[PDB]
Amino acid sequence: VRLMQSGDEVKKPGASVRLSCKADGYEFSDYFLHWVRQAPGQGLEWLGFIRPRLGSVNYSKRFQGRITMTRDMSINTVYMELRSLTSDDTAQYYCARMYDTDSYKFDSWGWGTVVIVSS
Amino acid sequence: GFLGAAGSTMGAASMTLTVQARNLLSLLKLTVWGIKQLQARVLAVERYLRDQQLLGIWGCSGKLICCTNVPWNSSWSNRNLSEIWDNMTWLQWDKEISNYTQIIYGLLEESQNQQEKNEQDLL
Amino acid sequence: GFLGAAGSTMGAASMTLTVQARNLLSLLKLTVWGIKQLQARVLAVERYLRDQQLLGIWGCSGKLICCTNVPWNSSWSNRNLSEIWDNMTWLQWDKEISNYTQIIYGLLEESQNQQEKNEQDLL
Amino acid sequence: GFLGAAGSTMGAASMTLTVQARNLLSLLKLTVWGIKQLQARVLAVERYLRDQQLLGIWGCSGKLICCTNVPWNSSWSNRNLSEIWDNMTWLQWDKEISNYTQIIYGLLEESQNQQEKNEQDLL
Amino acid sequence: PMTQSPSSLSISVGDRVTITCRSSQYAAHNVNWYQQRSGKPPKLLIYDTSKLQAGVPSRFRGGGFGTEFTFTISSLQPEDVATYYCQHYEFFGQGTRLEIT
Amino acid sequence: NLWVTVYYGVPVWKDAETTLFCASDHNVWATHACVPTDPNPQEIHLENVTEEFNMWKNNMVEQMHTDIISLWDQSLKPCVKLTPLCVTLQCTNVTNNITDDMRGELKNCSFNMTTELRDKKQKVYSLFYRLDVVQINNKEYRLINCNTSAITQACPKVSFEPIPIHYCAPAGFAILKCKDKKFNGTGPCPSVSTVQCTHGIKPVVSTQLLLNGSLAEEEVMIRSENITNNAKNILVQFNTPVQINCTRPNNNTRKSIRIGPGQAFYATGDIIGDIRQAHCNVSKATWNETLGKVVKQLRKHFGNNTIIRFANSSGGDLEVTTHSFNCGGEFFYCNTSGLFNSTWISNDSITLPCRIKQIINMWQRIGQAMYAPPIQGVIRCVSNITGLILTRDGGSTNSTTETFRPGGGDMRDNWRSELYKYKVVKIEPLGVAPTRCKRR
Amino acid sequence: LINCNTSAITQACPKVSFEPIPIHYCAPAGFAILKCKDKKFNGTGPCPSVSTV
Amino acid sequence: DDMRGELKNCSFNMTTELRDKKQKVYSLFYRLDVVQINNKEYR
Ligand SMILES: *[C@@H]1O[C@H](CO)[C@@H](O[C@@H]2O[C@H](CO)[C@@H](O[C@@H]3O[C@H](CO[C@H]4O[C@H](CO)[C@@H](O)[C@H](O)[C@@H]4O)[C@@H](O)[C@H](O[C@H]4O[C@H](CO)[C@@H](O)[C@H](O)[C@@H]4O[C@H]4O[C@H](CO)[C@@H](O)[C@H](O)[C@@H]4O)[C@@H]3O)[C@H](O)[C@H]2NC(C)=O)[C@H](O)[C@H]1NC(C)=O
Ligand SMILES: *[C@@H]1O[C@H](CO)[C@@H](O[C@@H]2O[C@H](CO)[C@@H](O[C@@H]3O[C@H](CO[C@H]4O[C@H](CO)[C@@H](O)[C@H](O)[C@@H]4O)[C@@H](O)[C@H](O[C@H]4O[C@H](CO)[C@@H](O)[C@H](O)[C@@H]4O)[C@@H]3O)[C@H](O)[C@H]2NC(C)=O)[C@H](O)[C@H]1NC(C)=O
Ligand SMILES: *[C@@H]1O[C@H](CO)[C@@H](O[C@@H]2O[C@H](CO)[C@@H](O[C@@H]3O[C@H](CO[C@H]4O[C@H](CO)[C@@H](O)[C@H](O)[C@@H]4O)[C@@H](O)[C@H](O)[C@@H]3O)[C@H](O)[C@H]2NC(C)=O)[C@H](O)[C@H]1NC(C)=O
Ligand SMILES: *[C@@H]1O[C@H](CO)[C@@H](O[C@@H]2O[C@H](CO)[C@@H](O[C@@H]3O[C@H](CO)[C@@H](O)[C@H](O)[C@@H]3O)[C@H](O)[C@H]2NC(C)=O)[C@H](O)[C@H]1NC(C)=O
Ligand SMILES: *[C@@H]1O[C@H](CO)[C@@H](O[C@@H]2O[C@H](CO)[C@@H](O)[C@H](O)[C@H]2NC(C)=O)[C@H](O)[C@H]1NC(C)=O
Ligand SMILES: *[C@@H]1O[C@H](CO)[C@@H](O[C@@H]2O[C@H](CO)[C@@H](O)[C@H](O)[C@H]2NC(C)=O)[C@H](O)[C@H]1NC(C)=O
Ligand SMILES: *[C@@H]1O[C@H](CO)[C@@H](O[C@@H]2O[C@H](CO)[C@@H](O)[C@H](O)[C@H]2NC(C)=O)[C@H](O)[C@H]1NC(C)=O
Ligand SMILES: *[C@@H]1O[C@H](CO)[C@@H](O[C@@H]2O[C@H](CO)[C@@H](O)[C@H](O)[C@H]2NC(C)=O)[C@H](O)[C@H]1NC(C)=O
Ligand SMILES: *[C@@H]1O[C@H](CO)[C@@H](O[C@@H]2O[C@H](CO)[C@@H](O)[C@H](O)[C@H]2NC(C)=O)[C@H](O)[C@H]1NC(C)=O
Ligand SMILES: *[C@@H]1O[C@H](CO)[C@@H](O[C@@H]2O[C@H](CO)[C@@H](O)[C@H](O)[C@H]2NC(C)=O)[C@H](O)[C@H]1NC(C)=O
Ligand SMILES: *[C@@H]1O[C@H](CO)[C@@H](O[C@@H]2O[C@H](CO)[C@@H](O)[C@H](O)[C@H]2NC(C)=O)[C@H](O)[C@H]1NC(C)=O
Ligand SMILES: *[C@@H]1O[C@H](CO)[C@@H](O)[C@H](O)[C@H]1NC(C)=O
Ligand SMILES: *[C@@H]1O[C@H](CO)[C@@H](O)[C@H](O)[C@H]1NC(C)=O
Ligand SMILES: *[C@@H]1O[C@H](CO)[C@@H](O)[C@H](O)[C@H]1NC(C)=O
Ligand SMILES: *[C@@H]1O[C@H](CO)[C@@H](O)[C@H](O)[C@H]1NC(C)=O
Ligand SMILES: *[C@@H]1O[C@H](CO)[C@@H](O)[C@H](O)[C@H]1NC(C)=O
Ligand SMILES: *[C@@H]1O[C@H](CO)[C@@H](O)[C@H](O)[C@H]1NC(C)=O
C-alpha cells in the first residue's frame, strides 16, 4: 500500500493551497483517508478525514471553514484545500489511511508535503 | 404394491404398510428439469423427515403400528370397532377425524414426555 | 412455547422438551428469495439429521431423556446435583462443559458399540 | 479411523462401526462451486436417509448390529461360519452375496410387519 | 486529549523504557502508539494497546486500560531513536524524544 | 453414584450466522416470492435471561444489504438498456412558465436516436434535469453517466414503494429480540424474547432522515458504537414521528420513444401548466420540539453545560449533502440546511428546496447506472421522519461546543435502525447432565 | 419484418429440433398420481375406476 | 533480428463513449492476432 503526496509548496499569506494524495495498492473505497499536519518541532495535529466511497468529510473544529477535502475516484486521489493561510500554517501535511473505524489505525502515511507560508 | 390396499378394509390395510412405506423417499445442472428435480428431491426428503419426526415424538419411531396411553374422547367417534375395522376403509376414516387430529397429536407427545420422565424416575 | 423454559431451572427445562423439539424442522424459482428459501430448507434438514444421528449413535434415538453407562470424571464438574438442578439453568451449564463435550461423545458411542456387542453375545 | 477396518477380519470389522458411521452425513451462491456443494449436501442427506429408512423398515433402527427371525437358505452361502468370520473380510463377502441380497431385504420387512402385528395381538 | 509524559529522557542502549500516556477521557483500549523517525513519516507499532502490527519486532509492548497507558520497548537499540506519539482516536499527544546517553 | 444423561431439545443457543428467508403478509423487492407469514405471529417471552446484543457487529444487517442490492439488480436486469441514449444532445434552457427557483434547472435537449429500423434516425426532444446533463467543451450536453457507467432504464411496471419484509430464520435457528426499552444498542439486554420472524422491516432508502421507520417507545434513543469516536455515525430514533410532506408540483408528461425493436425509452415531454420547484415541508414547531428532545438525550454522553449545535452537511456527493430519498417513483435530493441550523445552550413550515435526478447511481456502485422513467401527473408524499443519522465534528478547541451534522450514504446504517434489537442464534438441543440412572 | 416495431427477433437456433419427444411427468416421493381408467369419464366428476401411478 | 515484423502498429477507428462520435486510436497487435485482408489492411 503506497500513498504518494504532492510536491513541497510555498504560498503567500492569505492564499489557498491544494495538497494531493494519490493512493495505490488497495481498493480506494474501503479505508478512510485523514490529513494530519505537523508544525516544525511540534506534535501531530489532526485536520480532518474523508471517506473516498461517497466523499463524506469530517473536519476538525479548529480548521473548519478554512479546509475542504474532495476525492477523484478515477484519478484515485484525495485533495485537501486550505484557505486563508497564515504564518503558523508552515507545516508538513501527511495523508494517513485508517484501517478500521474503531481503533483509529493510521497504517500507511504519505511522504509528507511541507507548505511554507511566508511573505 | 404401492397404495394397493387403498380400498381394502381398515384391518387389511393396516396389515400391509411396508410396501407403501419404502416408496416415501425413493451432476446437477440448473436447467428447467434440473431445478425441478432438485425441488422434488428436497421436498421428498423434508416430507419423510417431518413424518418420522412426528412418529418419534410420540415414542413410535421404527414401529409401523404403535400404541399409546392417552384416552380417546367419545366425541371424536362413537362408531363401534367392528364396523370401523370391517366395513370401512382409511379414507373416509380420515375424513371424519381430520378436525380432531391436532389435539390428539398434542396428547400423544405429552404422554410420551410424561412416560419418559416416569422411566427416568423408575430407572 | 418454543424456548419458553430457557431461563427456567434445569429440571423444569428438562421436563418440557417436545414444544421446542417439533420446531427443529418445521414450485421452485431461482430468484433472490427462492435460493435463500432452498438454502434454509436444506440447512434445517441437515441440522436435524445431524442431531438425530448423534442421538442414534449413542443408543438414544427416539428418547428425549436417555441414560448412559459411561462414568463421569469429576474434573468435568464438581458441582453438586442439587444446585445444578435447582439454582441454575441450561445455558451457563453449557458454557462450563463446552470444552469436555467431544471426549464425552466418544465415550458415549464406544459404550453403545460395546453394549450392542454384548446383546449380540447374550441374545 | 474411517474405513480403517476395510481389510480387517469380518468379526473385527463388525466390532467397530461408529467411526465409519458418523462420517456418513458430515450464504448460498449459485456459482460453479456453490451448486456442486448444494448437490453434495442433498446427495449425502438423501443417501443417509435411504440407509436409515432401510434399517428402520427391518426393525433395526438405532442398532448397528440387529438380528432377524427370517431363515437363511443354504443357497445364499454354504461356507462355514468360522472361515466367514475368521479368514475373510466384508468386501468379497458382498461380492459373493450381492445378487442374493436383493431378495433377503424383502423377507426382512415381511418378518418385521408380522412381528409388529404379533405384538399388537399380544399387547 | 493526551498528556503523554515525559517530554524526553536519556536512555542507554538495551535499557527498558516506559512512557506514560495519562488521558483526560475514558479511552478504553483504543489507544495506539506511533514511532516517527527524524524526518521520516510516522510509523505505527502498537494498536489497541496490546496487539502488535506485522513487521514490528516483539520488543515493543503496551499496557493500560483506563486513563493511563504505558509503552515499553524492553531492549533499546540504536535504531529505536525516534519520537513516540500517543493516539486516542483523533487526538495525538506531545511526543517523547529518545536520546542515547 | 452419578452418570451422564443426554437430553434432546434443551433450550441452549449460541450466536451464529445463517440465511434468513423472507415472509410477507409488481415490486422491486420480490414480496410475492416471499412465503406467506402466519396471520398471528408467535413470540415467546423469556424469563431470567441475559444476552449480549451488538447492533453494530450484527450480521443480519449485512445480509439485508446484500439482499436489497440483489433484488435491485434482479429487478433492473430484464429491462431496457439505454446505451443508444449516450449521444451528443443539443440542449437549451426551458423558460416557459418557470419561477425564479427553477431558472435553468431543466434542459430542453433535442437529439438523434435510432428508430426501430436500423438504417433510419429520429430527431426527438426531451426534458433532462440539470443534474443529469454535463456540458461538452444551444450548447452540446451529454448524460452525466455516459463516461463511467451504462444506463439501464428503470423498468416502468415495477414499483419502488417499500413493502415490509419479515426476516425469518430457518428451522433450528431462532431470533432473540431485545425488548428492553432503554437498550442503547451495545451490551447486555435483561429482557430477551424469542421469535421466528422480524417485525416487517420496510426497505426504505434514505440518507439523512430515516423515513417510515420503527419508532422507540419510552424516549428518544441515541445509539452509537462509540460516541467518543467521530468516525461512527450516531443513529437517533424518535419516540414521536415528525411528519414531512414531499411534493413535485410539476405536471410531467411521459412520452414513449421507439429506440429499437420492442425497446422503448420514456422521456419527459413538455410540462403542462406551471413549472415549480419540488419541495418538502416539515412542521417548524414539531421539528424544534424533536430537536430539543434529541439534545436532551444527547447531553448525557457529553455532560451538562455543553453547547449542542446542528449545522448542515459538511460536504460530499449529492447523496450525503442532501436528504436523498425515493417516493412516487421519483428520487428527491432535498437541501436540509433549514433543519440543521440551530444552537442549544443549557403552522409555519420549514420548506426544503429539493432537486430531482433521473440518472440514479444507487448503491454507490460505479459501473451500473439507472434511469428512472418520468412519473405522470403531480407527485405528493407523506412520510414520518423516524430517525436521524448524525455525525460529530472532530477536534477539541478551547470551546466546549459540539456540532452534529447529518450524514448517511451507507445504507447499512439505514437498515441497522430496524435490526438493532434482533440477533440470530443457533439452537443446540443436545445436552449432557449428571443423573443417577443406568441402562438395564 | 412484421415484428420489428413490437418485439426483438431471436433466430430459431439451427441445431435444435422441434419434434415433440414424449415426456413423463413423475411426482416426487411422498406423492402419487391417480389415473382415471373409466372409459366413459367426461372430464368432471367422480371416477369409479382409479389407478395409482 | 528475431522479432522482424512480429508486432504490428495498427491504427483504427473505434466508437467513443458518445454514440455519434468516432475515435482514431492506435495499438500494438502481435502478428498471430491479425490477418491481412485482400500501410495495409488487417483484421
Ligand atoms: C412512507 O409511507 C407512505 C404511506 O405508506 C408513502 O406514501 C405513499 O406513497 C405511494 C408511492 O407509491 C403512493 O402511492 C401512489 O399514490 C398515487 C396517488 O394515490 C391516490 O390517488 C389515486 C387516484 O389518483 C387513488 O386511487 C389512491 O387510492 C390515492 O387516493 C397513485 O396514483 C399511484 O398509483 C400508481 O402507482 C402504483 C404503484 O406503482 C400503480 O399500481 C398504479 O396503477 C399507478 O401507476 C400507474 O398509473 C399511473 C397513472 O395512470 C401511470 O403514470 C403509471 O405509469 C402506472 O401505469 C400510487 O399508488 C401513496 O399514495 C402514498 N400514500 C400517502 C398517504 O401519501 C410514502 O411514500 C413513504 N415514504 C417513503 C417510502 O419514503
Ligand atoms: C450549508 O450552509 C452553508 C451556509 O453558508 C452553505 O454555504 C453557502 O453555499 C452557497 C452555495 O454554494 C454559497 O453561494 C455561492 O457563493 C459563491 C461565492 O462565494 C464567495 O464568497 C463566500 C463568502 O461569502 C466564500 O466563502 C466563497 O469561497 C466565495 O469566495 C457564488 O459564486 C455562487 O454562485 C453560484 O450560484 C449562484 C446562484 O444564483 C449563480 O447565480 C452563480 O452563477 C453561481 O452558479 C453561490 O452563490 C454561499 O456563499 C455559501 N455561504 C458561505 C458563508 O460560504 C453550504 O453550501 C451548505 N451546504 C450544503 C447545503 O450542503
Ligand atoms: C451503551 O451501554 C453500555 C452498557 O451500559 C455501555 O458500556 C459501558 O459504558 C460505561 C461508560 O462508558 C463503562 O464504564 C466504565 O468502566 C470502566 C471499567 O471498564 C469495565 O468494563 C470493561 C469492559 O471491557 C472491563 O474490561 C473492565 O475490566 C471493567 O470491568 C471504568 O474504569 C470507567 O470509570 C467507567 O465506569 C463500562 O465499562 C461499559 N461496559 C461495557 C461492557 O462496555 C456503553 O458505553 C453505552 N454506549 C453509549 C453510546 O451510551
Ligand atoms: C466523466 O466526466 C466528468 C465530467 O466531465 C468528469 O468529472 C470532471 O473531472 C474533471 C477532471 O478530469 C474535473 O476537473 C477538475 O475540476 C476542479 C474543480 O472542480 C479543478 O480544480 C481541477 O483542476 C480539474 O479541472 C471536473 O471538476 C469533474 N466534474 C465534476 C462535475 O465532477 C469525470 O472525471 C469523468 N469520469 C472519468 C474521467 O472517469
Ligand atoms: C422543447 O423544444 C421542442 C422543439 O424545439 C418544442 O417542441 C416544438 O415547439 C415548437 C415551437 O414553435 C412547436 O411548433 C412544435 O409543434 C413543437 N413540437 C415539435 C415536435 O417540434 C417544445 O415545445 C420545447 N419545450 C419547452 C420549451 O418546454
Ligand atoms: C442529426 O443528424 C443530422 C445529420 O447528421 C444532423 O444535421 C447535420 O448537422 C451538422 C452539424 O450542425 C451539419 O453540418 C449538417 O449540415 C447537418 N445535416 C443535416 C442533413 O441536417 C443533426 O444536427 C443531428 N441532430 C442533432 C440534434 O444534432
Ligand atoms: C409547502 O409550504 C409552502 C409554504 O408554507 C406552501 O406554499 C403555499 O402553497 C399554497 C398552495 O399552492 C399557495 O397558495 C401559497 O401561495 C404558497 N405560499 C408560499 C409562501 O409558497 C406549499 O403549498 C406547501 N406544500 C406542501 C406540499 O406541503
Ligand atoms: C403534511 O400534510 C398533511 C396532509 O397531507 C397535514 O395534515 C392534515 O392537514 C389538514 C389540513 O389542515 C387537516 O385537515 C388534517 O387534519 C391533517 N391531518 C391528517 C390528514 O392526518 C400536515 O399538517 C402537513 N405537515 C406539515 C405541512 O408539516
Ligand atoms: C441550501 O439552502 C441554503 C439556505 O436555504 C442555501 O444558503 C443560501 O444560498 C444562497 C445561494 O448562493 C445564498 O445567496 C444565500 O446567502 C445562502 N444563505 C444561507 C443562510 O446560507 C444553500 O446555498 C443551499 N445549498 C445548495 C442549494 O446546495
Ligand atoms: C505507432 O504509430 C503511432 C501513429 O500515431 C505512433 O504515435 C505517434 O508517433 C508520432 C511520430 O512522429 C508522434 O509525433 C505522435 O505524438 C505519436 N502519437 C500519436 C497519438 O500520434 C507510435 O509512436 C507508433 N508506435 C511504434 C512505431 O512503436
Ligand atoms: C476513420 O474514418 C475516416 C472517415 O470515415 C477515414 O478517413 C477516410 O478514409 C477514406 C479512405 O482513404 C477516404 O476516402 C476519406 O476521404 C477519409 N475521410 C476523412 C474524413 O478523412 C479513416 O481512414 C478511418 N480510420 C482508419 C484508421 O481507417
Ligand atoms: C467503543 O465501543 C466498543 C464496542 O462497543 C468498546 O469495546 C470500547 O470500549 C468503546 N471505546 C470507547 C472509548 O468508548
Ligand atoms: C442556461 O442555464 C445555465 C445554468 O444551468 C446558465 O449557465 C446559462 O447561462 C443559461 N443560458 C441562458 C439563460 O441562455
Ligand atoms: C445534568 O442535568 C440533569 C438535569 O437537567 C440532571 O438530571 C443530571 O443528573 C445532570 N448530569 C450531571 C450533573 O452529570
Ligand atoms: C395534471 O395534468 C392532468 C392532465 O392535464 C390533469 O388531469 C391533472 O388534474 C393535473 N394535475 C394537477 C395536480 O394539476
Ligand atoms: C407513518 O406514516 C404513515 C403514512 O403517512 C402513517 O399512516 C403512520 O401513522 C405514521 N406512523 C405513525 C406512528 O403515526
Ligand atoms: C512487414 O512484416 C511482414 C511480416 O509480418 C513482412 O511480410 C512484410 O514484408 C513487412 N513489410 C515491410 C517490411 O515493409
Numbering used by the authors:
A (entry chain J): 2 to 52, 52A, 53 to 82, 82A, 82B, 82C, 83 to 100, 100A, ...
B (entry chain F), C (entry chain B), D (entry chain D): 521 to 546, 565 to 661
E (entry chain N): 3 to 91, 96 to 107
F (entry chain A): 33 to 57, 66 to 138, 147 to 185, 188 to 306, 309 to 321, 321A, 322 to 397, 411 to 504
G (entry chain E): 193 to 245
H (entry chain C): 148 to 185, 188 to 192
What do the authors report?
Broadly neutralizing antibodies (bnAbs), capable of neutralizing diverse HIV-1 strains and subtypes, represent promising tools for immunotherapy and prevention. bnAbs target conserved epitopes on the HIV-1 Env trimer, including the CD4 binding site (CD4bs), glycan-dependent sites at the V3 base and V2 region, the gp120–gp41 interface, the membrane-proximal external region, the fusion peptide and the silent face. The highly conserved CD4bs is critical for virus engagement of host cells. To elucidate mechanisms of Env recognition, we determined single-particle cryo-electron microscopy (cryo-EM) structures of a BG505SOSIP.664 trimer unbound (2.9 Å) and in complex with representative Fabs from each expanded B cell clone: 04_A06 (3.8 Å), 01_D03 (3.2 Å) and 05_B08 (3.3 Å).
In each structure, R71 of the heavy chain contacts D368 of gp120, a feature typical of VRC01-class antibodies and a hallmark of CD4-mimetic bnAbs12. The presence and length of insertions in the three representative bnAbs correlated with the formation of interprotomer contacts. These insertions enable 04_A06 and 01_D03 to bury more surface area on Env than 05_B08 or other VRC01-class bnAbs, presenting another possible mechanism contributing to breadth, potency and resistance to escape.
